[PDB]
Structure 1
Amino acid sequence: SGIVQQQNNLLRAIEAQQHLLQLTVWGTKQLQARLSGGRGGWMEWDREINNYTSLIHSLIEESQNQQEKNEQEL
């Protein structure tokens, strides 16, 4: 199915962008150290990112499950 094949493509790109995104956050934090933010000034910022990250992994997780289920049924 070209439609089902496209979903897989979109999901994949999203997963790859998630790595890229996590690589960019890491890079940003390294800069933050050397530099200097305000001591704890970025705590909530960091917290918000972990919230989205966790949500994202969750969604990707459900999507991968839905992907296998759409490939057998549809």
Structure 2
Amino acid sequence: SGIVQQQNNLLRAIEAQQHLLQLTVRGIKQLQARSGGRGGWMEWDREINNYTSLIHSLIEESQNQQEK
């Protein structure tokens, strides 16, 4: 412990930041929507999805073997 009780907090902070990140993307999405568009943002969405997937995978594997 000690140094380990820190890597848990750092991970909790990252997990929460991700919730803030997904909140701002939703906000941006509703903003593009109500002003036409949303058709040319297809590639933008793809990149967001891909990076969110990579992070979720990173967080899951970190939550995993942190207990051992």
TM-score scaled by length of structure 1: 0.85
1:45 is displaced (CA, Å) by 0.2
- Distance in 1 (CA, whole Å) between partners of 2:25 and 2:41 is 12
* 8 Å CA contact retained: 2:32, 2:38: no
1:66 is displaced (CA, Å) by 2.0
Higher relative contact order (CA 8 A, sep 6+): 1
* 8 Å CA contact retained: 2:15, 2:59: yes
1:27 is displaced (CA, Å) by 0.4
Relative to structure 1, is the Cα distance of residues 39 and 21 closer, same or farther in structure 2, using a 3 angstrom cutoff?
closer
- Distance in 1 (CA, whole Å) between partners of 2:25 and 2:16 is 14
Identity %: 97
CA RMSD in angstroms, aligned pairs only: 1.2
User: Which is richer in helix?
Assistant: 1
Q: Secondary structure at the match of 2:3?
A: helix
Q: Which runs of 5+ in 2 are unaligned?
A: none
Runs of 4+, deviation exceeding 3 Å: 36-39
> Computing the radius of gyration over CA atoms, which structure comes out larger, 1 or 2?
1
Count of residue pairs brought into register by the alignment: 68
